[PDB]
Amino acid sequence: RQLENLVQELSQSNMMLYKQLEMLTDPSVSNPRNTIDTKDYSTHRLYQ
């Protein structure tokens, strides 16, 4: 049980360090800057 307590604490440490990695590696923007984005439909209307 005494070792299991530290196992729980280390697992808590591992999960709270797991939860920080995915926030810094989010591909929100998905050369994309050179091309006209289809989501940016204002540029599409401008071209049309």
């Binding site: 797991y18 920080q20 990695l21 929100s28 923007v29 050179n34 204002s42």
Partner: protein, 82 residues
């Protein structure tokens, strides 16, 4: 303990590589992005002064097209009667 050390290590190399998941159509008009430079260049080639309202590019350019159709017909008025 080794998994904790690996978590610290994988946290180390992710520091050099802050992108917020915000709407990108307005954000691409910001001049810091290269798309902002593209939009200011489009304003330059459409007669809009630099640093102006980037959202009035489409009303102005179509107005330019409205100006365009306000020219060629006059060309016919200077040609057929010619």
């Amino acid at each position: 303990s080794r998994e904790l050390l690996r978590c610290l290590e994988e946290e180390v190399r992710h520091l050099p590589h802050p992108l917020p998941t915000v709407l990108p159509s307005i954000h691409q008009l910001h001049p810091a992005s290269p798309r902002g430079s593209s939009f200011i260049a489009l304003s330059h080639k459409l007669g809009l002064p630099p640093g102006k309202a980037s959202e009035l590019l489409l009303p102005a350019a179509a107005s330019l097209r409205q100006d365009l159709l306000l020219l060629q017909d006059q060309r016919s008025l200077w040609c057929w009667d010619l």
